[PDB]
Amino acid sequence: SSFSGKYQLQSQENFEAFMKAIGLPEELIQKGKDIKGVSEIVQNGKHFKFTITAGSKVIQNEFTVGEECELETMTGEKVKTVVQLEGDNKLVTTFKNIKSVTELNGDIITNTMTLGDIVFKRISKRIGT
Ligand SMILES: CCCCCCCCCCCCCCCC(=O)O
Ligand SMILES: CCCCCCCCCCCCCCCC(=O)O
Numbered sequence: 729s730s731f732s733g734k735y736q737l738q739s740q741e742n743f744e745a746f747m748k749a750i751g752l753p754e755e756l757i758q759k760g761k762d763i764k765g766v767s768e769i770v771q772n773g774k775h776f777k778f779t780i781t782a783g784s785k786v787i788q789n790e791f792t793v794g795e796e797c798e799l800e801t802m803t804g805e806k807v808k809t810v811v812q813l814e815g816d817n818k819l820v821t822t823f824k825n826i827k828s829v830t831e832l833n834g835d836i837i838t839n840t841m842t843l844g845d846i847v848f849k850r851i852s853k854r855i856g857t
Contacts, residue, residue, distance in 0.1 A: 730816045731771040735837050735852040737764045746841065746848035750824070751803045759783060767837070767852060776811070776819075799823065 747757045765782035774793040779786065791797035791811045799821075800806050807823040814820055819830040827842045835854035840847060 729771045731769045731776070731819070731832055731837075733835075733854050734766060734768045734856060735835075736766045736855045738851045738853050740848070740850040742846055742848045746843065746846050747802060749843060749846060750801075750826070751805075756785075760785070765852075766855070774813075793819075 743761050744757055747760070748754070752760075760782055763782045765780060767781075768779045770777045774795075775790075776793070777788075777790045779788045781787075787800055789797075789799050791799065793811060793813050796808060796810055798806050798808055799811075801823065805824070809821050809823045811819055811821040817832045819828075821828050825843060827840075829840045831838050831840075837852045839850040839852070842848075
């Protein structure tokens, strides 16, 4: 259960440019750019559930490491992909040409999404249990 916990965004880089590019409606990005979203992760071996909450926006996802999964993304688009572990603390996947890396270091989770030259980075911090 390496990843299990509740974390809240501390800061992020390139939100507006990234979200605009991927098709997030401008009302959503203006509403969301300064929201400190909360991510809740439950890991049980290879099985993950996660919930991302940003204001009124609640996205729930699940996947099994190394298997095909269906992820609901920022816009609502559901994509078929595979999420892999690279060691106990790093989740890596790709969808819509975006590379997503989620890495836990103690209580800090860093998520990096790369689309072409755009690197959207989020840093979150554990908040309680
Ligand atoms: C009126 C409230 C609505 C606010 C709209 C929120 C728009 C932001 C949507 C993107 C949130 C998900 C991004 C995090 C994904 C990740 O890095 O793992
Ligand atoms: C909008 C969801 C996109 C899916 C992103 C990759 C899925 C595998 C990693 C899921 C762990 C969730 C960690 C979120 C970290 C954060 O909120 O910045």
